[PDB]
Amino acid sequence: MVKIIKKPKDVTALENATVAFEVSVSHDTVPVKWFHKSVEIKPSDKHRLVSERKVHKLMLQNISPSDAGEYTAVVGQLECKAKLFVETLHITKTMKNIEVPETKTASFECEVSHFNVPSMWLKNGVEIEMSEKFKIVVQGKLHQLIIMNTSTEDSAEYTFVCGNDQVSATLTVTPIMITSMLKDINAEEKDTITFEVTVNYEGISYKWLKNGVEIKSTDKCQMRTKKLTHSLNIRNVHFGDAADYTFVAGKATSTATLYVVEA
């Protein structure tokens, strides 16, 4: 006269979750057994068997992928079955190897299987910390690493760790090259002059030096960019302006001299 009333249902859960299967019967104090892979389940640190009047539960704690599969409750000669599906954290979109000119920004992105995966980024196997240099971003299932102001030292293999999965890609930081170098300028007192250089990449950072000292942007000394050309325009030149000028971008430099003929 014992009847199964409510049968166990499939469970889908993340690895490391605690889950349960439940069978209910028509009578109090009916003994039950549970099976997985054709072996009877015993109480353990992983498995808890709880009977409460008509309700019988199998609880599985801290599940691993090996716990996946079909579980059977046996009540007399009556049986019922349900399955556990264990979702694991994994990569769903990989990262791209990239080449980035020095001084420019590099970025890596991947996509993962689940929300709320913690950020974990490595550079050559060593954990990276968020800083002004490294921007670490999560946007739902999208994970991004932004590397500012790249230099040779940033060329490396970068890895995102996602549970027991990981994905890697390489950054190669490429050298700025000067395709048209500075030329000397031979000027007269009160002239306005313009030094010009052309480089191979747009969007690079640079500075200008006067006898090795960084020049301040002023009305007199204007520094501008047009496409791949960078200029230093000096108004109303005098003897004090006669000097060696250097354009610097990344590891690339070009130097020329301004001559100013007086009076």
Residue numbers in the entry: 3 to 265
Quoted passage from the original study:
To study whether this region is involved in interactions with the next Ig domain packed serially along the chain and, thus, whether the T2850I exchange influences the Ig-tandem architecture of titin, we determined the crystal structure of I9–I11 (comprising I10 in its poly-domain context) to 1.53 Å resolution. Three molecular copies were obtained in two space groups that agreed in showing I9–I11 in an extended conformation. Such extended arrangements are common in titin Ig-tandems. In I9–I11, the component domains follow a regular arrangement, where domains display relative torsion angles of 45°–68° and are connected by short, two-residue sequences (TL and PI, respectively). Here, domains interact directly through a limited number of contacts (section S2). Both I9–I10 and I10–I11 interfaces consist of a central hydrophobic residue contributed by the linker sequence (TL; PI), flanked by two polar interactions between loop residues from the neighbouring domains (inset). Residue T2850 is buried within the I10–I11 interface (burial fraction of side chain is 0.79 as calculated with FoldX). Here, T2850 preserves its intradomain hydrogen bonds (to T2897 and E2849) observed in the isolated I10 structure and, in addition, hydrogen bonds with S2952 from the BC loop of I11.
For this, we examined the unique mSNP T2850I in the I-band domain of titin I10, as a paradigm of an alteration in a general component of the titin chain. Domain I10 does not support specific interactions or have any known specialized roles, so it does not constitute an a priori sensitive locus of the chain. In previous studies, we have shown that the T2580I mSNP destabilizes the affected immunoglobulin (Ig) domain in titin, I10, and speculated that this instability increases the vulnerability of titin to proteolysis in situ potentially leading to myocardial damage.
